Structure formats: C-alpha cells, structure tokens
C-alpha cells in the first residue's frame, strides 16, 4: 500500500474522518473511501489528514483504505447540464444518466477582479409589476430576496425564471438568460414539485437544478451554492448570461455552522464561526457583468435569506445585505392581508439596477419610488383629521397598492406593464373601486391587445415613450375607464 497515493482511516466521527498517509495529497483534494463515499481533504497535518465527508458517517470505518483522486473539489460544467437535476458534486439525480460536460470547474473559483467588470445596464426582466417598476435588477447584479417563512420569496425568483421563456425561445443569444436554481436544505418533495412546475411551463430546458436537500450531509449543503456558481459561471465566461437563485443562504449558513462546531471552531455570534461572512461574500462576489474584452457575459445572483420574526438586523441578514447590491424585502404583514407580492417598498432597494431598467418603465415610474413608500407616511398616521389635501394621496396610494398586486405564475411583459402603471400614476383609477381594480386590469389588457396593439408593439420594440405614444396612450386609457 502506497501511503503516498493512498490512506488508512484512523478514526471517524462528527462528519470527519482522520486519515493516515495520503502524503502526496493536496489541500482540498477530493478523496474516495471504500464504500464509494467522497470526502474533502480539509486539514493536512503532520502524520494525518482530516477529511470532511460528503455522506453519512456510517459509510466509513476505521482501517479502511482511502484513495487520492488528483482533483481539488470540482464539477461538470457546460450547456449539456441544461434540463438536468444534479447534486452538489454534479452527480445527476433526475434518473437521466451521465452528465454531458464541456469540462470541469473547481467549486471555489476566484471572483472577477476590479478590471474585467462593467456596470450593469442590461435588464433582468422579472415580469413582476412591483419589482420591475421599483427594484429593477440588472444583468450582473446581486439582489437579495429576504423575509420571514412563507412570504413568497421563492415565488418571486420562480416567476423570474418562468418569465425568461419570453427570450429563450428567440434566436438572439444576447437577450437570453439561462437559469441555475440552487436548493439548499429544502425538502426533496418541494424540489421535485418545483421541477415539475418548471417542466409544465416549459422552463426546464433553459434551467439547471442543483439540490442538496434536508437529510443530506452538512458539507453537501455547504458546497452546493459553490458548485452551482461554476455551473453558472460557464455561461458568464462564454459570452452568455445566467441567473442563479440561492434558495436559501440561511440554510447554507446553518449547515456551515454544523460543520464548524463539529470541527471545534469557536462559536461566535449566534454560534456561527468567524468565517460565516466570507462564506457568503466569496460565493456572491462571483456574480458579475464582464467587459467587452472578457466577452460581455454576466452571472446574476438572487440569494434568498429567511428572517425570523421579521428582524433584518440579525447577524446573517445583515451579513448578506452588506454583500448584495440591494434587497427585495417581503413583509409577512402584507402577505397575510392578501397583498402579494408582499414587497415592502420602504425597505426594498436596488443599488445598480436603475441604469438597467427598461426606459418605458423608468418613464412611468416617475417618483413612484418616492410617492408610494411616502403615501406610507400618511397611511400610518391616518387611522386624527379628515383632511382635504392628504385625502387624495390616500386614494391614489390605495390604488397603486392594488395595481402592484399580482397572481402567481403570471409574469407580465413590459409593454403589458407600462399601461397599467401609466393608468395608475395619472389617476385614471381614482374613480374605480378597490374590489374591481383586479377585474379592471385583466379587462384593460384585453382591450389594449385587440384595439391598440400597434402601440404595445411600439413600447416593446423601442422601449421608450415618444411624446406621441405618450399622448396616444392617454387617449386609449380615458376611453376604457369611462365604460
């Protein structure tokens, strides 16, 4: 037995195997145990190596042989993973056979530096009225989806993926956006069901699923987002665009905490290791928009965080907020009232997306940012005087609040969006009741499609509002409202 290429197990417990030999091993090299279970050389010491396991401890005994692999932790990458569901190490879990890899990338890849980047200016269209109008996301950005349990976090990301069906059926490769969805810590059934939804809406052919679910070993959960970013990165490095959802990072952090405490690293705040920030920061730095010279690709990140009791000041929330380029905060209070998406506009922001917004939306979003989250000034005070001036903003406010509502699985085209907002901002809804704003919107879009389709087409094709189209839009709006 070569002790250079090979090892003998000294001990195993707490997700670590202590191994003797493997003298030629590299730090962070993947290893193989007798049972076929894999590991990662984490700490090389005089006279032994400490290996973190990617499975149950049952699958490793004392005295067993361990084989070197040659390879730092890596994964298959390339357009051949499209339509596929894999585990954190890249192994298919969808019943469909060997993955078709263009090649292999490390799990841990260094972020694009200061030079190879350019500011985001290309829209990521979500098809969500509230997000596209008020927290516009640009290709290369990082935008946190954050909020309590059961507040629509996943819905927001999933509508975004379903929405890409719009361009991923065209030919123009630059407008396309491939999707990597990472499930970390979720239930197997949630993810199975999610994939079936994707299949049913025909979204699956442009998306990749990477799953490390609830009963799997902490390191597989720790690892999944990293192997998913290299999968995402392939598109970035080859002049194409990929969206990556990390659902969710809260659970990644928890798994990382499990590993650190069993590794006997000192518990800090909320028991997380000191490096739990570096955990996320290195991951998320890999999202970017690249320069002309680097082929202009982009990886856009939508990490998901789960607050407890709505507290965005906890350690992990604030860590991620101090990394991403903004947050979409979802309030449980709005969610229970029926306001869904429950986007708390006061607390939501996109730091770089404004540039990348579609002009049409930008133009009918005049101050909507300021006004709405400020109607919130009056609204909170309202329930001391039956005022004159501030009775108007209470009626407009209430309207735009309904306009922003949106059914699930129903992402809407920009040119379907801008009229609804124009019709809100200019007060053509002021007269219509609350209970009918829902029906108004479906009936109004029908009207526009059948009768004023020339104009929608112009919004879609130029993305701007010429004074003439602006005036023509005023025309068609007034007509419908009157009846």
């Amino acid at each position: 037995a070569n002790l250079n290429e090979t090892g003998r197990v000294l001990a195993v417990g707490d997700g670590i195997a202590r191994v003797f030999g493997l003298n030629n091993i590299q730090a962070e090299e993947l290893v193989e145990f007798s049972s076929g279970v894999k590991g990662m050389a984490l700490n090389l010491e005089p006279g032994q190596v400490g290996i973190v396991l990617f499975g149950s401890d049952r699958l490793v005994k004392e005295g067993e042989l361990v084989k070197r692999t040659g390879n730092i932790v890596d994964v298959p990458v390339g357009p051949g993973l499209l339509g596929r569901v894999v585990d954190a190490l890249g192994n298919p879990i969808d019943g469909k056979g060997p993955i078709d890899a263009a090649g292999r990338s490390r799990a841990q890849v260094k972020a694009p530096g200061i030079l190879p980047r350019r500011s985001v200016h290309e829209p990521v269209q979500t098809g969500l009225k509230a997000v596209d109008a008020l927290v516009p996301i640009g290709r290369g950005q990082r935008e946190l989806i954050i909020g309590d349990r059961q507040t629509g976090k996943t819905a927001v990301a999933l509508d975004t993926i379903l929405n890409q069906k719009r361009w991923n059926n065209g030919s123009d490769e630059s407008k396309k956006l491939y999707c990597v969805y990472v499930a970390v810590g979720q239930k197997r059934s949630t993810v199975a069901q999610l994939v079936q939804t994707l299949e049913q809406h025909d979204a699956m052919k442009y998306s990749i699923i990477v799953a490390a679910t609830a009963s799997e070993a902490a390191p597989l959960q720790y690892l999944a987002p990293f192997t998913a970013a290299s999968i995402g990165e392939w598109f970035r490095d080859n002049g194409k665009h990929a969206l990556i959802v990390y659902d969710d990072l809260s659970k990644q952090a928890v798994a990382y905490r499990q590993l650190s405490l069993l590794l006997r690293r000192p518990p800090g705040r909320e028991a997380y290791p000191g490096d739990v920030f570096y955990l996320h920061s290195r991951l998320l730095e890999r999202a970017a928009k690249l320069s002309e010279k680097e082929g202009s690709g982009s990886l856009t990140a939508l990490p998901v965080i789960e607050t407890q009791g709505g507290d965005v000041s906890a350690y992990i929330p604030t860590n991620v907020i101090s990394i991403t380029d903004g947050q979409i905060f979802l309030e449980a209070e709005l969610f229970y009232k029926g306001i869904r998406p429950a986007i708390n506009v006061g607390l939501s922001v996109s730091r770089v997306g404004s540039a990348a917004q579609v002009k049409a939306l930008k133009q009918v979003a005049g101050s909507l940012k300021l006004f709405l989250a400020q109607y919130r000034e009056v609204a909170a005070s309202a329930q001391s005087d039956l005022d004159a001036s501030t009775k108007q903003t209470l009626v407009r406010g209430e309207r735009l609040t309904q306009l922003l509502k949106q059914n699930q699985y129903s992402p809407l085209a920009t040119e379907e969006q801008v009229p609804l907002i124009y019709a809100g901002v200019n007060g053509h809804l002021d007269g219509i009741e609350l209970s009918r704003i829902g029906e108004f919107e479906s009936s109004f879009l029908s009207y526009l499609k059948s009768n004023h389709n020339e104009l929608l087409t112009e919004i879609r094709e130029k993305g701007e509002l010429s004074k003439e189209l602006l005036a023509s839009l005023k025309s068609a709006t007034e007509s419908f409202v009157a009846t």
Partner: protein, 53 residues
C-alpha cells in the same frame, strides 16, 4: 354636551392607544425573545471556552 363629547373622545383615543400599545408589546416581545436566545447562547460560549482549556 361637552361631557358626552369628551367621553366619546376618550373611548376613541383609548381605542387608538390600546391598539398602538399592543403594537409595541408585539415589537418588544420579539426583541425580548431575541435577547433571551442570545443570553442562553452567550452564557453557553463562556462555559464552552472554559471547558476547552
């Protein structure tokens, strides 16, 4: 008339207050709970550091 106006205004102002109070009670029951958890953890870390040496 001034009395019945006053008495109606009391029951009305107090309704808004008890409502507004409960809201703070809700916001502080949450902070309480955070702090309580933090207290148990932080105490445990001292026991832990102490045990390791």
């Amino acid at each position: 008339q001034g009395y019945a106006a006053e008495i109606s205004a009391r029951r009305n102002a107090m309704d808004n207050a008890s409502k507004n109070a409960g809201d703070m009670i809700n916001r502080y029951s949450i902070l309480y709970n955070r702090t309580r958890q933090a207290v148990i953890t932080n105490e445990l870390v001292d026991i832990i550091t102490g045990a390791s040496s």
